[PDB]
Amino acid sequence: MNIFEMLRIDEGLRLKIYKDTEGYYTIGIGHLLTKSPSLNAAKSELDKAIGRNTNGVITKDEAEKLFNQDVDAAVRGILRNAKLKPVYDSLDAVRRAALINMVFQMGETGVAGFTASLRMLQQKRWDEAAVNLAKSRWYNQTPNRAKRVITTFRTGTWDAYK
Ligand SMILES: [Cl-]
Numbered sequence: 001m002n003i004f005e006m007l008r009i010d011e012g013l014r015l016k017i018y019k020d021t022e023g024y025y026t027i028g029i030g031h032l033l034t035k036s037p038s039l040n041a042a043k044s045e046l047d048k049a050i051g052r053n054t055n056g057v058i059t060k061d062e063a064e065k066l067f068n069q070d071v072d073a074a075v076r077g078i079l080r081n082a083k084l085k086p087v088y089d090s091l092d093a094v095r096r097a098a099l100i101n102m103v104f105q106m107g108e109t110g111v112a113g114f115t116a117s118l119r120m121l122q123q124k125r126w127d128e129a130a131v132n133l134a135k136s137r138w139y140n141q142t143p144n145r146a147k148r149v150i151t152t153f154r155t156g157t158w159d160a161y162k
């Protein structure tokens with residue numbers, strides 16, 4: 001298992017514009033297009049992201065290309081974030097993937113706001129971080145996915161995903 005497979009399970013793959021858990025227009029493997037309520041606005045963002053006139057539908061390859069850029073962007077965002085970097089540097093392979101999953105979902109600023117959990121992870125206090133992680137809007141709105149990520153930090157294995 002790896003980060004790509006992990007997020008492909010968490011996000012699914014949809015080749016037509018759809019609304020995510022929050023009601024925002026998205027496509028592919030969790031690629032957010034826009035927070036605007038306008039479909040045309042989404043379609044326009046989509047065309048600009050793909051580079052062709054899509055009419056709201058993309059191909060598998062096109063979805064995978066957005067996904068690659070999004071994963072790379074999340075890794076690079078962690079590495080540039082003064083708050084996230086040290087956490088990431090301190091973690092093992094599997095757990096690094098869990099951190100990337102969170103940033104991909106909520107963005108770096110969002111994850112950087114989990115001060116206590118970040119500190120707990122850095123300290124390798126797995127069970128404590130897991131409980132703290134669960135006291136969040138994140139966990140309350142998307143509990144099944146949250147539980148999978150939380151299990152991954154707690155255990156350091158991919159068990160939640162097999
Ligand atoms: Cl883009």
Ligand SMILES: [Cl-]
Binds near residue numbers: 141142143144145146
């Ligand atoms: Cl969920």
